[PDB]
Amino acid sequence: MAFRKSNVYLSLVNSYIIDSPQPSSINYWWNMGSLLGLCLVIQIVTGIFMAMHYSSNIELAFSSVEHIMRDVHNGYILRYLHANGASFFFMVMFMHMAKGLYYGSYRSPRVTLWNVGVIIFTLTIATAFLGYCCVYGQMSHWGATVITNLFSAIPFVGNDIVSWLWGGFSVSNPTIQRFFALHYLVPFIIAAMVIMHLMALHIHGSSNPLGITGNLDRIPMHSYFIFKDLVTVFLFMLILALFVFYSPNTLGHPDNYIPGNPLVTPASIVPEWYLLPFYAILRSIPDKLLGVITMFAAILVLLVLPFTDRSVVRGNTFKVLSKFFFFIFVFNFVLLGQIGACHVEVPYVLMGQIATFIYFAYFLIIVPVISTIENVLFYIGRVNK
Amino acid sequence: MAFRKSNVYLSLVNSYIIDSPQPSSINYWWNMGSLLGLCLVIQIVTGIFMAMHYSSNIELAFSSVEHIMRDVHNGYILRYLHANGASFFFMVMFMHMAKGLYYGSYRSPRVTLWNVGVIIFTLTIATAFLGYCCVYGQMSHWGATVITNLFSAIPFVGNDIVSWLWGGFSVSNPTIQRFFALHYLVPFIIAAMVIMHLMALHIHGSSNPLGITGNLDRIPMHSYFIFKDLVTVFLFMLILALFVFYSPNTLGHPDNYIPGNPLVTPASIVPEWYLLPFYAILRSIPDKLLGVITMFAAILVLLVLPFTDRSVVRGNTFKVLSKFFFFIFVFNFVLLGQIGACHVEVPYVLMGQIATFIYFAYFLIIVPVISTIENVLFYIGRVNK
Amino acid sequence: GPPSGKTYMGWWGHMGGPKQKGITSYAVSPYAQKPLQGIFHNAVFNSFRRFKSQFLYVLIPAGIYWYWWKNGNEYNEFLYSKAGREELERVNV
Amino acid sequence: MTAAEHGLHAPAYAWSHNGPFETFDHASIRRGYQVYREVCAACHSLDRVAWRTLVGVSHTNEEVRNMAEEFEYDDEPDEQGNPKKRPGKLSDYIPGPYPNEQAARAANQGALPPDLSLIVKARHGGCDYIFSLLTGYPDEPPAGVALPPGSNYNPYFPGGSIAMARVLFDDMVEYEDGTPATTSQMAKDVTTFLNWCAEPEHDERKRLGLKTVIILSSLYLLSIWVKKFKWAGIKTRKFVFNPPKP
Amino acid sequence: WRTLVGVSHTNEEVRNMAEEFEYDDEPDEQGNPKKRPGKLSDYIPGPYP
Amino acid sequence: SSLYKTFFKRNAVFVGTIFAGAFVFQTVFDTAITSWYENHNKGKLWKDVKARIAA
Amino acid sequence: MLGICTHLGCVPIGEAGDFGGWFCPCHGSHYDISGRIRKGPAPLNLEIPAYEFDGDKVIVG
Amino acid sequence: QSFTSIARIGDYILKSPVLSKLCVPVANQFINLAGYKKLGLKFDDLIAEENPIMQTALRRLPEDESYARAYRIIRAHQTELTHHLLPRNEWIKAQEDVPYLLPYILEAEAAAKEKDELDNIEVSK
Ligand code: HEC
Ligand code: HEC
Ligand code: HEC
Ligand code: HEC
Numbered sequence A, B: 001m002a003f004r005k006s007n008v009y010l011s012l013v014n015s016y017i018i019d020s021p022q023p024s025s026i027n028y029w030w031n032m033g034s035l036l037g038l039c040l041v042i043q044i045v046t047g048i049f050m051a052m053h054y055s056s057n058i059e060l061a062f063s064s065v066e067h068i069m070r071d072v073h074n075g076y077i078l079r080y081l082h083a084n085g086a087s088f089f090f091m092v093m094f095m096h097m098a099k100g101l102y103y104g105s106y107r108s109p110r111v112t113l114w115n116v117g118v119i120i121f122t123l124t125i126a127t128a129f130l131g132y133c134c135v136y137g138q139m140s141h142w143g144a145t146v147i148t149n150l151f152s153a154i155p156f157v158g159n160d161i162v163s164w165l166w167g168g169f170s171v172s173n174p175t176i177q178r179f180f181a182l183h184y185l186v187p188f189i190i191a192a193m194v195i196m197h198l199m200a201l202h203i204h205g206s207s208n209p210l211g212i213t214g215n216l217d218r219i220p221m222h223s224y225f226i227f228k229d230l231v232t233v234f235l236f237m238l239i240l241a242l243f244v245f246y247s248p249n250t251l252g253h254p255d256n257y258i259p260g261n262p263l264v265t266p267a268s269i270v271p272e273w274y275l276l277p278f279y280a281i282l283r284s285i286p287d288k289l290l291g292v293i294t295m296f297a298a299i300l301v302l303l304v305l306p307f308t309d310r311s312v313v314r315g316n317t318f319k320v321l322s323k324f325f326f327f328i329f330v331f332n333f334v335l336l337g338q339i340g341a342c343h344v345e346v347p348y349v350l351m352g353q354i355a356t357f358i359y360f361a362y363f364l365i366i367v368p369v370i371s372t373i374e375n376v377l378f379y380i381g382r383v384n385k
Numbered sequence C: 001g002p003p004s005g006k007t008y009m010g011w012w013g014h015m016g017g018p019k020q021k022g023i024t025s026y027a028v029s030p031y032a033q034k035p036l037q038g039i040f041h042n043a044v045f046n047s048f049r050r051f052k053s054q055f056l057y058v059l060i061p062a063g064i065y066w067y068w069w070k071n072g073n074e075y076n077e078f079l080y081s082k083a084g085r086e087e088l089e090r091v092n093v
Numbered sequence D: 001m002t003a004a005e006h007g008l009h010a011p012a013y014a015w016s017h018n019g020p021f022e023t024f025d026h027a028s029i030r031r032g033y034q035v036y037r038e039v040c041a042a043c044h045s046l047d048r049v050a051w052r053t054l055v056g057v058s059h060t061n062e063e064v065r066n067m068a069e070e071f072e073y074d075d076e077p078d079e080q081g082n083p084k085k086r087p088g089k090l091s092d093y094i095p096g097p098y099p100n101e102q103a104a105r106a107a108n109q110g111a112l113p114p115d116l117s118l119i120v121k122a123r124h125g126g127c128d129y130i131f132s133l134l135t136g137y138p139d140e141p142p143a144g145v146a147l148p149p150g151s152n153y154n155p156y157f158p159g160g161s162i163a164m165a166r167v168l169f170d171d172m173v174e175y176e177d178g179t180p181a182t183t184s185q186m187a188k189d190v191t192t193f194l195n196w197c198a199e200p201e202h203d204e205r206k207r208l209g210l211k212t213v214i215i216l217s218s219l220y221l222l223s224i225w226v227k228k229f230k231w232a233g234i235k236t237r238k239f240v241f242n243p244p245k246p
Numbered sequence E: 001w002r003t004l005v006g007v008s009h010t011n012e013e014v015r016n017m018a019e020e021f022e023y024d025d026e027p028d029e030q031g032n033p034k035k036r037p038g039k040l041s042d043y044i045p046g047p048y049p
Numbered sequence F: 001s002s003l004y005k006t007f008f009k010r011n012a013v014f015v016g017t018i019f020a021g022a023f024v025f026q027t028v029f030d031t032a033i034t035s036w037y038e039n040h041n042k043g044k045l046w047k048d049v050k051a052r053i054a055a
Numbered sequence G: 001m002l003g004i005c006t007h008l009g010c011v012p013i014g015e016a017g018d019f020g021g022w023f024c025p026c027h028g029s030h031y032d033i034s035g036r037i038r039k040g041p042a043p044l045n046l047e048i049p050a051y052e053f054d055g056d057k058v059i060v061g
Numbered sequence H: 001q002s003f004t005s006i007a008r009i010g011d012y013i014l015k016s017p018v019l020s021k022l023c024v025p026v027a028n029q030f031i032n033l034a035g036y037k038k039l040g041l042k043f044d045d046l047i048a049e050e051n052p053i054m055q056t057a058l059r060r061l062p063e064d065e066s067y068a069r070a071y072r073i074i075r076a077h078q079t080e081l082t083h084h085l086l087p088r089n090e091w092i093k094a095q096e097d098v099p100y101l102l103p104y105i106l107e108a109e110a111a112a113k114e115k116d117e118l119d120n121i122e123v124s125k
């Protein structure tokens, strides 16, 4: 047989990238996965090169980043690429996730595929946050303070886990140095998790926009999808280029250009845009313990979808009620984000509380109810007795 | 079928660790591989925990290691484990390699298996060296100086590659910081390489001491070899424990407890014991360029063995002349090491030169000649015409 | 899945060996065997045998290398003592 | 290489801390500290040792507090910005005799007395070497040795020519515990104290070692037995061949 | 100071500007501290200590 | 050995009993070692030196 | 001159070797009283940097 | 190294009475020191089989020899794992240590060599 088939190493590449049978009808929404691998590489590469010039000590961290910005040849390109890359990493991840939601990609027999993806999402949030703390700006310090304190909510030992995590009395030199060590480690765990994601994808293959079987008409990954992936890879790079060279700080916060100060918290704190929806959910619960539990639940609830989707067909392509509600969910998520950027003031607090309700209700009430109703409608519209 | 067989993830574990058919007769020499995985884990774990307290700046590196030694709870255990672990990593690797040499493990159809192993050996040498430089003691600085200068031997651009590698005029703050970044990275490349090593091993399986087929009588990896591996794992730990707690600095150099000094090179420099044989080979050639080429060739020559072994049977078990010469090679290697620890003085220089000759002659002259002679002896001792 | 390359090892039921016939194996449960203690009296004089056949292949090459090392060392010591400073100027440069 | 260049090999003295089951002698550490303060501190720093580490080792919490307060350290600037001093606290590190390397050389013919914090681990020979060097200054150098001006002869030091003169002489210290302060007694003491400075974890490390080695030994023996049991069926397995008819 | 050269001032102009300020130099042969005029490698000094 | 058959009766020891025993062992063993160790070095420790001191 | 061994970069030891000059402990290169390479792997003589005199002092640069 | 080559050299030595009396006694001593006979193996059992020539050869080997090779190999592995040798009366005798597979190996090599020759034949007009 061909060498690409017989060689122990090449056959892996052949089965995953060259001869892999793809459903002839997949659309550009299926291009986000490769875009996610690309993002992972860009983050690792630019990160290692900057690590060569970075100092983790609390007295030097901020200045070492400035050193990367002012003295390292092409240093600012590395930092703006790494920083803006993290944002682009989340924009693409949400689209990857939303695509799965809309087409019922989370359904059997791809449950394992969906669950591993949830784990990756969590690991990515943890990674970006740790990286954020390495700049040691004003936002960095308080973020490191808030997130680590999240654990004090645990009864009895909670405050202990916290002083442990800090390695002292407060967010200090033992904190930022362990955060750097950890920021370097986690990306390699994501890589291993990405491999398990791909292994799970390979056993049943990709789904398609029609939601039905692809077994009757497949075309090779090689040529068709390699070249189609190239189209979005270049588009992705063009847009990232525009931010990196023309508007490098639009997705950041001015407060991070101010060194961290243990005694003063900024008058207006607005977290990273991709964390805003979660920040709003946290803020909407006037109880400490319940506040953190509901926030974590906002992520874990994604695990419930394979069971609450009562439909008999996969995906929202041929479903009027489901498409409509799908978009209520999308814009509700954006709203939550907008609320997160506002002050805890009158019309906003109640709006935040209702939006949070709607978010959870989609998974637990709307989907099961709507899918059941749609099942029946499909039946009585054709049976004549 | 059993769940361990059907699950996508568990089947990998089942095929490699549980149901893998092993030749019933393999001996304790086949236990070194698992011991090498264990070493890799011990190095990564202890390394990450120390990274939490380490500073890469040239003005703080040495003191941060002292900080790990004096202030970090259980810090000295971490450092002595990491340091002594590197040595144990090489003791076990040499035995793994020697085992392969003796039993003809490098022969067809396991050539790919042997070549990947050579790459791992090189990556391990590079890793330990970079780690050595992170202590920034006297030996560290000069080692970083010598090894990076090794590249100036390249004609035309050589001195450029060097100033590039240094990131300046000499081994300085840009050097040690990039070395730390690199020391953290490489171990994960070794891990990936170790996976490819295992993939190559899985297609044809392990060889055995008789050198013949194992297909007529195999027993499951699970139970038999899992428990046999446990025996050497504990023995390995006992011995490492003795060095870590009772004699932590016997395998190190006193000069590394002295901060690096750009203006003074120690009166007596003795590299890491596992690099001595290579140091002796380098020192034996009174020419700069030829000196470094011969040293690198001392490693690459391992690639030649599948072609120069002219024998018709695998391994030295039933071969009088080959067993004898195998041990000449082993003790010649130890001798080279002893020469490396001595001063460049009269009886030693000539001894070093002859030992180097013998080292290369084993692969290029002795093995092909001896194996041919043995082939003929085997024939004329039974054919009656 | 994709077709796999031919190897020299299969798996349980199709390992790749030749067809066996005529051979009969017998075994007794480890549970019914004498608790580990009989590895003496009967299994002691038999041991050490697998090294009486090998030590020569190890000892001779070792011996050769030990004497070579000892010789050159003692010569070095002499060269750098008072008595040998004369011969040292001869062999040195 | 000539013996004069390598240096005289230090012999093996019977230190009470030699041996897997032995702790340092803390009384000796205590005395050693005094010898360091009254003799060595004049030219040698001990930068890596913090006052607090002495508490519970060679001195009481109170004693160390008094000792640290005799020295001044830079404090945080006042309400107006002008610099100000302050007495020492347990958190501080034992101060050295010189403000910089240049002043250290100026006071020693141009030589640099090294920091003694790691000296015991930074020299082949360890304790045996330090002790031997201190008590091995002959009244007169061997015949023929052209000793450079300002240097001293010591056989244990490589090359024989050392920039440190003999500094220990009988009864130059009044040991608080009553012990006769002979030159060998003092050398024996500082060295022990210097060993502790370099390896403060010593006593604890050896205790943990004893636990670790007992468990692993037991585990090792136990595994052998378990392995043999699990293998007995294969080991005693027997075969018989009966040639199949054509 | 060096970053000003070729941006808003000439190499000469910046050199003159930097030299009007004093920075801590390396101690003398005997250990006593000493000052020194500024060079291009230095960073623009601030009004407060 | 009938001593075994009285506690476990022809069955192996279960994880729970193993974990429980491990917690007991950890404490007993540590005291036994610290004891023997301190007794072996009697006269050299700070405890012993503190007694011979009066301030 | 520059005390950088021309072989692989170590700093030669003063008043040592077999030619009354400097000796590199790293791989054994001997230099003479002019700083020239006499024996060993080093291929060149210790490099001389640009310098001028000014009375009692020399200015290396 | 091919068996065709081993035979060429071995036969040349075997025919000439000069070398035949000088070498064979050394070779016989070599074979006894090897010790494979104490494990119940015949030299031909030791030939590495992971290549096409040997697979063809073992495939052409008559049934009775094949079952016997199988028993010898299994018996060898079991003795090896026990770290013993077979009782002397079970050792393979010199008369038994016959090159039984050799004729099949040489036939296959010639067939193989011919094909290599024919696939590359040049033509002269
Ligand atoms: C100043 C007058 C000193 C006093 C008092 C003591 N030491 Fe010293 N020491 C001094 C110098 C100038 C040097 C440099 C020697 C050289 O040739 O480089 C030293 C060196 C040492 C060393 C290191 C020796 C080595 O092996 O490199 C040691 C171990 C040492 N000194 C110990 C020591 C102790 C314990 C002292 C008090 C008992 C002591 N020194 C006093 C100068 C002076
Ligand atoms: C050491 C390698 C390294 C890896 C691997 C790495 N980073 Fe970073 N990252 C850094 C360093 C160094 C910084 C600090 C410099 C900076 O601010 O960009 C940083 C900073 C960050 C920041 C802060 C950006 C800002 O505003 O300055 C984020 C967010 C981040 N990383 C995200 C990621 C993500 C997401 C990944 C991987 C999927 C990743 N990093 C992988 C080294 C790494
Ligand atoms: C960051 C994670 C990390 C990883 C992964 C790691 N190391 Fe290290 N290593 C360090 C740090 C930090 C030091 C410095 C502290 C020290 O000296 O032990 C170090 C030091 C070393 C040293 C010097 C030991 C000494 O004498 O102090 C060696 C040798 C070494 N590493 C070998 C290895 C090997 C071999 C591996 C892996 C196969 C490895 N390291 C993996 C972090 C790591
Ligand atoms: C929470 C869910 C989730 C996350 C996050 C996730 N994935 Fe996926 N991924 C899926 C699902 C479900 C599919 C199956 C899509 C289908 O066939 O409908 C999929 C499919 C893929 C594909 C196939 C092509 C495509 O886009 O459909 C690739 C490649 C892939 N993912 C890569 C990644 C990478 C790389 C990451 C992030 C580092 C990632 N995924 C994170 C859910 C996820």
Ligand code: HEC
Residues within 6 Å of the ligand: B029, B030, B031, B032, B033, B034, B036, B037, B040, B093, B096, B097, B100, B103, B104, B105, B106, B110, B113, B114, B116, B117, B118, B120, B121, B190, B194, B197, B201, B205, B206, B207, B208
């Ligand atoms: C230069 C050679 C070489 C190096 C270095 C090497 N291996 Fe191997 N390895 C082999 C060969 C050849 C075999 C096949 C042994 C056989 O079956 O005869 C092997 C087999 C193995 C096995 C099977 C069990 C055994 O020990 O035979 C394991 C596990 C393994 N190697 C792990 C590793 C790991 C982990 C490393 C290092 C990080 C490593 N090897 C490095 C050559 C190498």
Ligand SMILES: COc1c(O)c(C)c(C/C=C(\C)CC/C=C(\C)CC/C=C(/C)CC/C=C(\C)CC/C=C(\C)CCC=C(C)C)c(O)c1OC
Residues within 6 Å of the ligand: A016, A017, A020, A022, A026, A030, A031, A033, A034, A037, A038, A040, A041, A044, A045, A048, A191, A194, A198, A201, A205, A206, A225, A229, B188, B189
């Ligand atoms: C079934 O459906 C599929 C499908 O299966 C696939 C595979 C794709 C194609 C997409 C992919 C395969 C994405 C895969 C991505 C990955 C495997 C990424 C793995 C990630 C990594 C980060 C690798 C790790 C990298 C390193 C350790 C090295 C980087 C660092 C370096 C080189 C440092 C160098 C240093 C110096 C000093 C020079 C599809 O588009 C698709 O659609 C239908």
Ligand SMILES: COc1c(O)c(C)c(C/C=C(\C)CC/C=C(\C)CC/C=C(/C)CC/C=C(\C)CC/C=C(\C)CCC=C(C)C)c(O)c1OC
Residues within 6 Å of the ligand: A188, A189, B016, B017, B020, B022, B026, B030, B031, B033, B034, B037, B038, B040, B041, B044, B045, B048, B191, B194, B198, B201, B205, B206, B225, B229
């Ligand atoms: C055919 O023959 C075989 C055979 O095939 C096998 C497999 C074995 C058995 C041996 C092995 C399988 C060895 C395998 C070893 C590996 C796969 C090692 C892989 C290595 C790694 C280093 C994994 C990487 C680890 C990490 C990323 C995580 C570590 C870090 C952590 C947990 C940080 C935690 C942080 C905080 C703050 C708590 C045999 O003995 C054998 O003999 C006959």
Ligand SMILES: CCCCCCCC1=C(O)C(=O)c2scnc2C1=O
Residues within 6 Å of the ligand: B125, B139, B140, B142, B143, B144, B146, B147, B269, B270, B271, B272, B275, B278, B279, B282, G026, G027
């Ligand atoms: C395979 C690579 C072998 C490495 C050989 C370099 C050995 C080596 C030297 O040659 C040297 O001069 C110095 S100075 C301090 N350490 C070293 C060292 O390790």
Ligand code: FES
Residues within 6 Å of the ligand: G005, G006, G007, G008, G009, G010, G024, G025, G026, G027, G028, G029, G040, G041, G042
């Ligand atoms: S560096 Fe001076 S001899 Fe190699």
